[PDB]
Amino acid sequence: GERVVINISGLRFETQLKTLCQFPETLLGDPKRRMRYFDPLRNEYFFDRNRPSFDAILYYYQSGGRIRRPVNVPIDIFSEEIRFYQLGEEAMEKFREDEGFLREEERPLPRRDFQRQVWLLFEYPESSGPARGIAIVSVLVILISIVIFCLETLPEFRFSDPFFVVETLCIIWFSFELLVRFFACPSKATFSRNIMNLIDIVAIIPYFITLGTELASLAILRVIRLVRVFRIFKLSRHSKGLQILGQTLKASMRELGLLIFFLFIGVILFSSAVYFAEADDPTSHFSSIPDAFWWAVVTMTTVGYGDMHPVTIGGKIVGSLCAIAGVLTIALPVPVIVSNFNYFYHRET
Amino acid sequence: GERVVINISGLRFETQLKTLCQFPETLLGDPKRRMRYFDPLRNEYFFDRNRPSFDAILYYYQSGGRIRRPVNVPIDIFSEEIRFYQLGEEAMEKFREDEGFLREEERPLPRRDFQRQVWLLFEYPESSGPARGIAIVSVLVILISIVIFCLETLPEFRFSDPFFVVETLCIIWFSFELLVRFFACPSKATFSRNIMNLIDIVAIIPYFITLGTELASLAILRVIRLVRVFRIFKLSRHSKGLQILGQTLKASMRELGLLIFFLFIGVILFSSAVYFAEADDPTSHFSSIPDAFWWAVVTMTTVGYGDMHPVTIGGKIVGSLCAIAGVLTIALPVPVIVSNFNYFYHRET
Amino acid sequence: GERVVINISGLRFETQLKTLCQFPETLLGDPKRRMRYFDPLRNEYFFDRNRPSFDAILYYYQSGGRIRRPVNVPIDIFSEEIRFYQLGEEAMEKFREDEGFLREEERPLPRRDFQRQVWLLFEYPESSGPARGIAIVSVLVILISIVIFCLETLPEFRFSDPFFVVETLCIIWFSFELLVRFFACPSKATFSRNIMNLIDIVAIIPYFITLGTELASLAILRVIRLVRVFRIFKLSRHSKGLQILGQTLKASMRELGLLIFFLFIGVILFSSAVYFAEADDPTSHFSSIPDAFWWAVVTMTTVGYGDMHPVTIGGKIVGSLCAIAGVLTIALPVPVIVSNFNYFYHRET
Amino acid sequence: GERVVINISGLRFETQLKTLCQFPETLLGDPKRRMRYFDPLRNEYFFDRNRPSFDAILYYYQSGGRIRRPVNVPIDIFSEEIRFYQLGEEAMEKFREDEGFLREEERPLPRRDFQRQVWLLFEYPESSGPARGIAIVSVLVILISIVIFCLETLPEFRFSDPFFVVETLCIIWFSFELLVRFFACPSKATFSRNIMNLIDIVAIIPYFITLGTELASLAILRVIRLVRVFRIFKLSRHSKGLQILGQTLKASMRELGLLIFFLFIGVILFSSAVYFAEADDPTSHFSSIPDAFWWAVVTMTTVGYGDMHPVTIGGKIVGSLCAIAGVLTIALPVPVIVSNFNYFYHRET
Ligand SMILES: [K+]
Ligand SMILES: [K+]
Ligand SMILES: [K+]
Ligand SMILES: [K+]
């Protein structure tokens, strides 16, 4: 009913009393808090603050709580000017969600102290000196493990085996680390759904199941042997770029389906267009359409080994079209992935 | 003649009566609708609304209907503030056309009910459960058809033929689907000009004409056989990225002419510059200028099979220039295509 | 001395009389032109125009002539609002130079009429029907000429020669066209400095000098023969993308020097780093540092023919570094070239 | 206590006296300087200046010194309007640091004159004609030196050696130049920490140590011989793009660690996934996991020599995945490097 004139260094704003009456916990809400700024001479609440930012605040008061930072007032000034009018931590968290970078999560510390000290030791390498010692010994053990996996397959080589002893030491360290992390955890229920620990479990299961099978088929001699390579992803816990890549390959999971689907269409199109072109030629490298898949996938991605290439004046035309088509399809859903990685990289820094 | 002062929370706007008299169906147009906001004390129409957005509204009233959203007021607030002053659905559709994303099309439903129910069943997979069942069976039939086209050409293989029986089943399903879509259509005239149905017709004509020719030349044994591959594009009806790609390759049809023309110039330039360089050498792979086309098109697009490469200290210079020139020409009209795909992808989402 | 209050729909602007007295040919300059807008009631020049645009106009009046379009008011409104206050064609051309797209050039027409009619016939294909006929016959003659240059070098082939007769016809057409363009020109002095005509001269000189030499050395049998290929650039007069490419490769002539210099450094670095690595090996493909240039330039540009590749566990490391280095150097000065092409392409459209 | 109304051409700003009293050396600070603008009629300090820029100035006066250029007022106007109110060189340097391009460094000239003249002669080629003569002779000597390093290793060739005499002349010139730069320097302490002189020292040490060893092992016959190539980086002193590249490869040193780490993960993943796939095949090119590193690094970077490629229907699948994975990883940290180069290139121009 009563009009409140708010003189932001000359810029007058007029509002109804009810519009401020929405929030009785803000600076303009309580009559007593704002009464010091009242000037009897012109009956206007004199402020000397930033001008282009009070408009957003007033719209907040006039919209029930919505806050939109105008692009004119930079982030710092608008932060200072949302603090001054003391809209509250709720409004500030709302503005944080609107602008992005929602760093409102807090890592929960174990209930007791001893277990919490274990946690701060094994996790958060920067917490303590011994913590960073542990977190560097557990990256040297991983590098030793990778070297012993890659070096065990040499032709000169392939339980007195030194490589077996090194692998057993690596698994013992992995087990000890995982046991400390699971037992001394704040909650097993939250621990269970965590990729960085499912990886640590998957990188140790093959060794245990191998010992069980040997102590007591072709699947457990090739698939398990390959699964043993997942210890390369345990190098994500002690690294930062890898977590960014994992979050990128999780956010942009549809623009990888597009890349694979576009490749699958361009292979079935150009391989079938180059086989039917070489059909009469007796010198052709392509015996059938499913044979030219290996040519289309190394032409569209512009690798081009040269082991299989077209050999008629009609397969050369299709292989001129295939390179341009591969450039167009594999570079139409990659920039989306690169923009999502750029966002997931510059948010943290 | 009379000046109307409009106090947008202190920000006064003064306008002539004639300027509001243009539109007698808006909030400020009818005197009775706006009379509730009139304040006798200062003779100004008091509003408590968003300030930076009323300027665009006033310019609308002062320009005969033109609307331009100022970049200061975000889309949501400006939408709320074009609703409040009730400019009309016409102005709102105009603002939608100005900002982009013209989602004003409505799918026409068949006149009757039974035919409309058929339509909602075969089209719009999300409409009904059986609708999504049909729309997934018709993607499995397509995948079976592609597998039978790609697998019929194996050397071990090439009407008791199992592959013929599978292909006949696929064509019968395609025919049944197309017949349901054409008969139970809202309008055959609008149905005719639709790419996604011309594709469905082109992917079934070769089978019918083959049966006709066999039941009763070299063209119908190679060109038709190749045309049978167009069933890979029937996988666009049951997919979303493919429609985006088709619209991209339709919007940016000049920046593909540029890519093909730039390739055609760089081939005729560098192949003719590498043949004349290898002319005296007896070991050269290039016998003539039209022979070095197959080297220039696999060098400029940076595939490089190695089957044909230069062999003098003067063809090696031209093959050092060719790679850099191919990078420069094929990556000068591709970013336009990628920006048009980015627009056609982020409009829908 | 006297303050002029200018009420832009409530937004008052106050200025000195001297500030408007700078320009006695504008709307606010002449007292008689602006006197109709004077309102005796409040003594303020009432306007109902766009508000956010009059600030730029007032700054123009207060800065001696400088004009800067504020990013708030779109181009169309600001154009309308620079027309209304009738700042002049001079100010409008200044604003055109500030915003870009300086389309103020006008093609000069020949002094007389007959010669001007010839010009409108041979140039400006869209001017007349016969003009477009000529401009399409002169693109078919060019394509015939390219085909006869590329097809004369076939092994089966290489003055009763049909190819000679076709080439003579092409040169006769080129000569006739060039003669019409030079004679019936507005100015030979301006005609001389024009690339698109220097190209037309260079594509015809080799034929004349060949006839002179044959009618009456090794240089005139290879270099001139290669120079004959410049008729591919005569296809720029009858094309639009090619002119954009030529202007791109003229504007960004320093970011090609960077590409060539970066390649020249990475070749001299990695070829010298891979030769010294393979020195003891007897199976190496690299005999000397200037021999590994042909490997470094097909690795850094990621073509990779495979004709020359490293063969020790120390040349394989350098060839792992070479691919990543080539990606980093040849893709550090290419995006500048692509942005200059994007500007030179979207300016015209 | 007293309110100062500042009429920026109608736009009134009201401020406390204390807010201007912060800075007693600015235009509004001293009462005498601002008294000429005081108007007794309305008691407001009349200015006719740019309107959208005075808000930033007022916020400067109200924030203790902080300055943020609003994006509405272009750089030129805001520069003019920070000069007018004479905020000071300190504020102007602060605004320069805020906007970027901190060109506040000044090259220190030697204390005396003769030594300063030497400096202006050897450095700053544009200072003097003889200076540019020296700075071009020292780029021809470098090019001669590179040619003699690259040409000494030819098979036909490998102290009467002409190549030795040319190399000795080059080193003598390098020594003379370095001696002049170090002796006639403003400060040896600042001279020591400078990359462009450490390079000049490293490109001359190998020759001196070679003469010492020969005048009076395998390391000094290969590693030193390779180190002799660092004279290619002495071509950075007499070039501008190279300094930009060096600053790019210094600023973005983490997004190269990402490229190398992503390559190291994708090699250990796909090489181990293609070796285990080819294990039973007797025709495989991969004998062990550390052997397939040379395939993964020439597939992921899409070079693809063809010397080693997969040969089973299970290694071909992994080599279809490897090309797409290499495109995704090596093009996820390259655009950061390219944006840092774009910044370091367009700052100087
Ligand atoms: K390649
Ligand atoms: K290749
Ligand atoms: K190759
Ligand atoms: K490539």
Side-chain angles (χ1 to χ4, degrees):
Chain A
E2 298 187 31
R3 311 90 203 175
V4 177
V5 40
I6 305 167
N7 188 266
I8 302 304
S9 68
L11 185 54
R12 309 206 318 178
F13 299 74
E14 289 192 41
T15 36
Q16 283 184 348
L17 197 62
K18 183 259 172 60
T19 299
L20 305 184
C21 203
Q22 291 187 156
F23 301 87
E25 57 171 339
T26 67
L27 200 154
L28 298 86
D30 290 310
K32 300 189 66 169
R33 233 189 186 95
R34 63 187 190 181
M35 77 188 305
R36 45 174 296 182
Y37 300 103
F38 170 83
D39 287 52
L41 196 70
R42 290 89 66 65
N43 287 359
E44 49 180 5
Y45 290 4
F46 201 147
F47 297 67
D48 42 16
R49 309 290 304 184
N50 181 270
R51 284 165 58 98
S53 170
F54 190 83
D55 169 59
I57 303 312
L58 194 57
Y59 178 69
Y60 155 86
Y61 285 153
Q62 285 189 161
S63 70
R66 175 64 51 62
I67 287 188
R68 294 303 200 87
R69 172 186 63 76
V71 312
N72 182 3
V73 166
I75 315 175
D76 289 6
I77 311 181
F78 189 46
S79 300
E80 182 193 321
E81 295 294 334
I82 199 174
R83 277 295 180 176
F84 173 74
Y85 299 108
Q86 54 170 253
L87 304 187
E89 45 187 358
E90 48 188 1
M92 178 72 188
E93 86 184 18
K94 188 177 284 310
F95 153 68
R96 281 193 173 103
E97 292 192 14
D98 201 303
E99 71 173 356
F101 318 143
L102 179 58
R103 253 168 64 80
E104 293 286 66
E105 70 278 356
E106 48 188 17
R107 300 290 296 265
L109 280 184
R111 53 170 172 239
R112 282 164 270 181
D113 168 60
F114 184 77
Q115 64 168 357
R116 180 190 57 181
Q117 178 60 240
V118 170
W119 192 267
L120 298 165
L121 189 61
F122 271 72
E123 298 202 15
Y124 318 101
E126 289 196 332
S127 171
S128 176
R132 188 143 72 259
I134 292 299
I136 294 311
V137 155
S138 188
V139 188
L140 252 186
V141 161
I142 287 175
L143 257 300
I144 274 299
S145 184
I146 287 172
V147 171
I148 289 317
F149 167 61
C150 289
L151 221 64
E152 191 174 23
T153 69
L154 277 172
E156 62 169 351
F157 290 92
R158 67 148 176 76
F159 269 104
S160 306
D161 299 83
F163 282 178
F164 175 88
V165 175
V166 178
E167 176 159 326
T168 295
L169 289 192
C170 295
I171 265 63
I172 284 168
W173 184 265
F174 291 143
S175 204
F176 192 91
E177 182 177 22
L178 181 59
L179 285 190
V180 168
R181 289 202 171 99
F182 163 87
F183 274 87
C185 67
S187 50
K188 157 189 55 184
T190 308
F191 181 91
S192 173
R193 210 176 190 184
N194 189 352
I195 294 306
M196 278 181 305
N197 290 284
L198 285 184
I199 294 186
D200 184 280
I201 291 183
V202 174
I204 199 180
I205 294 169
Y207 174 85
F208 279 144
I209 69 180
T210 290
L211 208 64
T213 49
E214 185 166 0
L215 168 139
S217 198
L218 192 59
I220 56 181
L221 304 181
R222 171 169 167 254
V223 199
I224 266 61
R225 201 108 305 174
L226 209 170
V227 161
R228 277 204 319 172
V229 87
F230 274 3
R231 63 189 65 170
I232 183 61
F233 293 152
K234 197 183 308 187
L235 205 54
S236 82
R237 196 177 202 100
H238 325 298
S239 177
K240 228 69 170 181
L242 219 47
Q243 303 179 6
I244 302 161
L245 174 69
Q247 302 175 2
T248 291
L249 293 199
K250 179 201 305 180
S252 67
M253 209 175 196
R254 170 168 154 76
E255 298 100 18
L256 285 171
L258 284 188
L259 187 51
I260 297 305
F261 189 48
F262 286 168
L263 275 66
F264 161 70
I265 287 188
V267 178
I268 300 293
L269 189 54
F270 292 112
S271 100
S272 173
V274 76
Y275 163 76
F276 280 143
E278 309 237 347
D280 48 293
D281 273 59
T283 189
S284 75
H285 308 73
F286 313 97
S287 80
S288 45
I289 296 181
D291 195 8
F293 298 164
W294 179 238
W295 173 66
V297 288
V298 312
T299 285
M300 296 191 49
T301 68
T302 68
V303 174
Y305 291 141
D307 55 358
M308 284 176 35
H309 58 108
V311 273
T312 317
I313 325 164
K316 300 180 172 310
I317 300 173
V318 184
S320 290
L321 267 306
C322 207
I324 309 160
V327 167
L328 296 179
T329 60
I330 313 203
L332 247 51
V334 161
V336 185
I337 301 180
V338 179
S339 299
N340 278 295
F341 178 85
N342 264 32
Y343 159 54
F344 271 89
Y345 184 65
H346 293 132
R347 152 214 274 185
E348 302 187 341
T349 68
Chain B
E2 298 187 31
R3 311 90 203 175
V4 177
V5 40
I6 305 168
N7 188 266
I8 302 304
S9 68
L11 185 54
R12 309 206 318 178
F13 299 74
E14 289 192 41
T15 36
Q16 283 184 348
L17 197 62
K18 183 259 172 60
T19 299
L20 305 184
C21 203
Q22 291 187 156
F23 301 87
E25 57 171 339
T26 67
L27 200 154
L28 298 86
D30 290 310
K32 300 189 66 169
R33 233 189 186 95
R34 63 187 190 181
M35 77 188 305
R36 45 174 296 182
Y37 300 103
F38 170 83
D39 287 52
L41 196 70
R42 290 89 66 65
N43 287 359
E44 49 180 5
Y45 290 4
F46 201 147
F47 297 67
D48 42 16
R49 309 289 304 184
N50 181 270
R51 284 165 58 98
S53 170
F54 190 83
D55 169 59
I57 303 312
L58 194 57
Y59 178 69
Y60 155 86
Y61 285 153
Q62 285 189 161
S63 70
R66 175 64 51 62
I67 287 188
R68 294 303 200 87
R69 172 186 63 76
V71 312
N72 182 3
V73 166
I75 315 175
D76 289 6
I77 311 181
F78 189 46
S79 300
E80 182 193 321
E81 295 294 334
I82 199 174
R83 277 295 180 176
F84 173 74
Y85 299 108
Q86 54 170 253
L87 304 187
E89 45 187 358
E90 48 188 1
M92 178 72 188
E93 86 184 18
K94 188 177 284 310
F95 153 68
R96 281 193 173 103
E97 292 192 14
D98 201 303
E99 71 173 355
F101 318 143
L102 179 58
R103 253 168 64 80
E104 293 286 66
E105 70 278 356
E106 48 188 17
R107 300 290 296 265
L109 280 184
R111 53 170 172 239
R112 282 164 270 181
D113 168 60
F114 184 77
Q115 64 168 357
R116 180 190 57 181
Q117 178 60 240
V118 170
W119 192 267
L120 298 165
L121 189 61
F122 271 72
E123 298 202 15
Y124 318 101
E126 289 196 332
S127 171
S128 176
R132 188 143 72 259
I134 292 299
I136 293 311
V137 155
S138 188
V139 188
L140 252 186
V141 161
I142 287 175
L143 257 300
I144 274 299
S145 184
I146 287 172
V147 171
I148 289 317
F149 167 61
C150 289
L151 221 64
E152 191 174 23
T153 69
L154 277 172
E156 62 169 351
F157 290 92
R158 67 148 176 76
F159 269 104
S160 306
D161 299 83
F163 282 178
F164 175 88
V165 176
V166 178
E167 176 159 326
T168 295
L169 289 192
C170 295
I171 265 63
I172 284 168
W173 184 265
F174 291 143
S175 204
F176 192 91
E177 182 177 22
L178 181 60
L179 285 190
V180 168
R181 289 202 171 99
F182 163 87
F183 274 87
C185 68
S187 50
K188 157 189 55 184
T190 308
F191 181 91
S192 173
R193 210 176 190 184
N194 189 352
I195 294 306
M196 278 181 305
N197 290 285
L198 285 184
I199 294 186
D200 184 280
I201 291 183
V202 174
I204 199 180
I205 294 169
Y207 174 85
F208 279 144
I209 69 180
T210 290
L211 208 64
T213 49
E214 185 166 0
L215 168 139
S217 198
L218 192 59
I220 56 181
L221 304 181
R222 171 169 167 254
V223 199
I224 266 61
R225 201 108 305 174
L226 209 170
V227 161
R228 277 204 319 172
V229 87
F230 274 3
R231 63 189 65 170
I232 183 61
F233 293 152
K234 197 183 308 187
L235 205 54
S236 82
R237 196 177 202 100
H238 325 298
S239 177
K240 228 69 170 181
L242 219 47
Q243 303 179 6
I244 302 161
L245 174 69
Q247 302 175 2
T248 291
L249 293 199
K250 179 201 305 180
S252 67
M253 209 175 196
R254 170 168 154 76
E255 298 100 18
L256 285 171
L258 284 188
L259 187 51
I260 297 305
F261 189 48
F262 286 168
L263 275 66
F264 161 70
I265 287 188
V267 178
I268 300 293
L269 189 54
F270 292 112
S271 100
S272 173
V274 76
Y275 163 76
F276 280 143
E278 309 237 347
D280 48 293
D281 273 59
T283 189
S284 75
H285 308 73
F286 313 97
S287 80
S288 45
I289 296 181
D291 195 8
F293 298 164
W294 179 238
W295 173 66
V297 288
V298 312
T299 285
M300 296 191 49
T301 68
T302 68
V303 174
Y305 291 141
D307 55 358
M308 284 176 35
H309 58 108
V311 274
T312 317
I313 325 164
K316 300 180 172 310
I317 300 173
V318 184
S320 290
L321 267 306
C322 207
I324 309 160
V327 167
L328 296 179
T329 60
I330 313 203
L332 247 51
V334 161
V336 185
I337 301 180
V338 179
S339 299
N340 278 295
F341 178 85
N342 264 32
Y343 159 54
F344 271 89
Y345 184 65
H346 293 132
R347 152 214 274 185
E348 302 187 341
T349 68
Chain C
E2 298 187 31
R3 311 90 203 175
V4 177
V5 40
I6 305 168
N7 188 266
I8 302 304
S9 68
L11 185 54
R12 309 206 318 178
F13 299 74
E14 289 192 41
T15 36
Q16 283 184 348
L17 197 62
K18 183 259 172 60
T19 299
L20 305 184
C21 203
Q22 291 187 156
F23 301 87
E25 57 171 339
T26 67
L27 200 154
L28 298 86
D30 290 310
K32 300 189 66 169
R33 233 189 186 95
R34 63 186 190 181
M35 77 188 305
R36 45 174 296 182
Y37 300 103
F38 170 83
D39 287 52
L41 196 70
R42 290 89 66 65
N43 287 359
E44 49 180 5
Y45 290 4
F46 201 147
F47 297 67
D48 42 16
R49 309 289 304 184
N50 181 270
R51 284 165 58 98
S53 170
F54 190 83
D55 169 59
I57 303 312
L58 194 57
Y59 178 69
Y60 155 86
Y61 285 153
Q62 285 189 161
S63 70
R66 175 63 51 62
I67 287 188
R68 294 303 200 87
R69 172 186 63 76
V71 312
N72 182 3
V73 166
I75 315 175
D76 289 6
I77 311 181
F78 189 46
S79 300
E80 182 193 321
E81 295 294 334
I82 199 174
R83 277 295 180 176
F84 173 73
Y85 299 108
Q86 54 170 253
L87 304 187
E89 45 187 358
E90 48 188 1
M92 178 72 188
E93 86 184 18
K94 188 177 284 310
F95 153 68
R96 281 193 173 103
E97 292 192 14
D98 201 303
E99 71 173 355
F101 318 143
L102 179 59
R103 253 168 64 80
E104 293 286 66
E105 70 278 356
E106 48 188 17
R107 300 290 296 265
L109 280 184
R111 54 170 172 239
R112 282 164 270 181
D113 168 60
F114 184 77
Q115 64 168 357
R116 180 190 57 181
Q117 178 60 239
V118 170
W119 192 267
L120 298 165
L121 189 61
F122 271 72
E123 298 202 15
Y124 318 101
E126 289 196 332
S127 171
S128 176
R132 188 143 72 259
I134 292 299
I136 293 311
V137 155
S138 188
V139 188
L140 252 186
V141 161
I142 287 175
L143 257 300
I144 274 299
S145 184
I146 287 172
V147 171
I148 289 317
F149 167 61
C150 289
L151 221 64
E152 191 174 23
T153 69
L154 276 172
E156 62 169 351
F157 290 92
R158 67 148 176 76
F159 269 104
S160 306
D161 299 83
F163 282 178
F164 175 88
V165 175
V166 178
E167 176 159 326
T168 295
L169 289 192
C170 295
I171 265 63
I172 284 168
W173 184 265
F174 291 143
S175 204
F176 192 91
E177 182 177 22
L178 181 60
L179 285 190
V180 168
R181 289 202 171 99
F182 163 87
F183 274 87
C185 68
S187 50
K188 157 189 55 184
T190 308
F191 181 91
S192 173
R193 210 176 190 184
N194 189 352
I195 294 306
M196 278 181 305
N197 290 284
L198 285 184
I199 294 186
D200 184 280
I201 291 183
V202 174
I204 199 180
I205 294 169
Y207 174 85
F208 279 144
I209 69 180
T210 290
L211 208 64
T213 49
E214 185 166 0
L215 168 139
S217 197
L218 192 59
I220 56 181
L221 304 181
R222 171 169 167 254
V223 199
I224 266 61
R225 201 108 305 174
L226 209 170
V227 161
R228 278 204 319 172
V229 87
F230 274 3
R231 63 189 65 170
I232 183 61
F233 293 152
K234 197 183 308 187
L235 205 54
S236 82
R237 196 177 202 100
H238 325 298
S239 177
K240 228 69 170 181
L242 219 47
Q243 303 179 6
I244 302 161
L245 174 69
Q247 302 175 2
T248 291
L249 293 199
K250 179 201 305 180
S252 67
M253 209 175 196
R254 170 168 154 76
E255 298 100 18
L256 285 171
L258 284 188
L259 187 51
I260 297 305
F261 189 48
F262 286 168
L263 275 66
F264 161 70
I265 287 188
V267 178
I268 300 293
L269 190 54
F270 292 112
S271 100
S272 173
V274 76
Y275 163 76
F276 280 143
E278 309 237 347
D280 48 293
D281 273 59
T283 189
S284 75
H285 308 73
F286 313 97
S287 80
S288 45
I289 296 181
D291 196 8
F293 298 164
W294 179 238
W295 173 66
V297 288
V298 312
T299 285
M300 296 191 49
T301 68
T302 68
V303 174
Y305 291 141
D307 55 358
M308 284 176 35
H309 58 108
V311 274
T312 317
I313 325 164
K316 300 180 172 310
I317 300 173
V318 184
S320 290
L321 267 306
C322 207
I324 309 160
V327 167
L328 296 179
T329 60
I330 313 203
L332 247 51
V334 161
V336 185
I337 301 180
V338 179
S339 299
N340 278 295
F341 178 85
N342 264 32
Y343 159 54
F344 271 89
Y345 184 65
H346 293 132
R347 152 214 274 185
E348 302 187 341
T349 68
Chain D
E2 298 187 31
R3 311 90 203 175
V4 177
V5 40
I6 304 168
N7 188 266
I8 302 304
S9 68
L11 185 54
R12 309 206 318 178
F13 299 74
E14 289 192 42
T15 36
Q16 283 184 348
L17 197 62
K18 183 259 172 60
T19 299
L20 305 184
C21 203
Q22 291 187 156
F23 301 87
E25 57 171 339
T26 67
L27 200 154
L28 298 86
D30 290 310
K32 300 189 66 169
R33 233 189 186 95
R34 63 187 190 181
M35 77 188 305
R36 45 174 296 182
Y37 300 103
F38 170 83
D39 287 52
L41 196 70
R42 290 89 66 65
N43 287 359
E44 49 180 5
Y45 290 4
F46 201 147
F47 297 67
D48 42 16
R49 309 289 304 184
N50 181 270
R51 284 165 58 98
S53 170
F54 190 83
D55 169 59
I57 303 312
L58 194 57
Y59 178 69
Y60 155 86
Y61 285 153
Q62 285 189 161
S63 70
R66 175 64 51 62
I67 287 188
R68 294 303 200 87
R69 172 186 63 76
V71 311
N72 182 3
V73 166
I75 315 175
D76 289 6
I77 311 181
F78 189 46
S79 300
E80 182 193 321
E81 295 294 334
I82 199 174
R83 277 295 180 176
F84 173 74
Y85 299 108
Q86 54 170 253
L87 304 187
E89 45 187 358
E90 48 188 1
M92 178 72 188
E93 86 184 18
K94 188 177 284 310
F95 153 68
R96 281 193 173 103
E97 292 192 14
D98 201 303
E99 71 173 355
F101 318 143
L102 179 59
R103 253 168 64 80
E104 293 286 66
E105 70 278 356
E106 48 188 17
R107 300 290 297 265
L109 280 184
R111 53 170 172 239
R112 282 164 270 181
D113 168 60
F114 184 77
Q115 64 169 357
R116 180 190 57 181
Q117 178 60 240
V118 170
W119 192 267
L120 298 165
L121 189 61
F122 271 72
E123 297 202 15
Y124 318 101
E126 289 196 332
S127 171
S128 176
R132 188 143 72 259
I134 292 299
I136 293 311
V137 155
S138 188
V139 188
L140 252 186
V141 161
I142 287 175
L143 257 300
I144 274 299
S145 184
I146 287 172
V147 171
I148 289 317
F149 167 61
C150 289
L151 221 64
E152 191 174 23
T153 69
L154 277 173
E156 62 169 351
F157 290 92
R158 67 148 176 76
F159 269 104
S160 306
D161 299 83
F163 282 178
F164 175 88
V165 176
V166 178
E167 176 159 326
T168 295
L169 289 192
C170 295
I171 265 63
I172 284 168
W173 184 265
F174 291 143
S175 204
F176 192 91
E177 182 177 22
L178 181 60
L179 285 190
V180 168
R181 289 202 171 99
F182 163 87
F183 274 87
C185 67
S187 50
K188 157 189 55 184
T190 308
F191 181 91
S192 173
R193 210 176 190 184
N194 189 352
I195 294 306
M196 278 181 305
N197 290 285
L198 285 184
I199 294 186
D200 184 280
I201 291 183
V202 174
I204 199 180
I205 294 169
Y207 174 85
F208 279 144
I209 69 180
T210 290
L211 208 64
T213 49
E214 185 166 0
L215 168 139
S217 198
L218 192 59
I220 56 181
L221 304 181
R222 170 169 167 254
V223 199
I224 266 61
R225 201 108 305 174
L226 209 170
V227 161
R228 277 204 319 172
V229 87
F230 274 3
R231 63 189 65 170
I232 183 61
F233 293 152
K234 197 183 308 187
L235 205 54
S236 82
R237 196 177 202 100
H238 325 297
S239 177
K240 228 69 170 181
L242 219 47
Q243 304 179 6
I244 302 161
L245 174 69
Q247 302 175 2
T248 291
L249 293 199
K250 179 201 305 180
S252 67
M253 209 175 196
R254 170 168 154 76
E255 298 100 18
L256 285 171
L258 284 188
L259 187 51
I260 297 305
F261 189 48
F262 286 168
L263 275 66
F264 161 70
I265 287 188
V267 178
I268 300 293
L269 189 54
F270 292 112
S271 100
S272 173
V274 76
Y275 163 76
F276 280 143
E278 309 237 347
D280 48 293
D281 273 59
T283 189
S284 75
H285 308 73
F286 313 97
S287 80
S288 45
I289 296 181
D291 195 8
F293 298 164
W294 179 238
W295 173 66
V297 288
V298 312
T299 285
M300 296 191 49
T301 68
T302 68
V303 173
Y305 291 141
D307 55 358
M308 284 176 35
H309 58 108
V311 274
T312 317
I313 325 164
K316 300 180 172 310
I317 300 173
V318 184
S320 290
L321 267 306
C322 207
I324 309 160
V327 167
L328 296 179
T329 60
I330 313 203
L332 247 51
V334 161
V336 185
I337 301 180
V338 179
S339 299
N340 278 295
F341 178 85
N342 264 32
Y343 159 54
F344 271 90
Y345 184 65
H346 293 132
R347 152 214 274 185
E348 302 187 341
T349 68

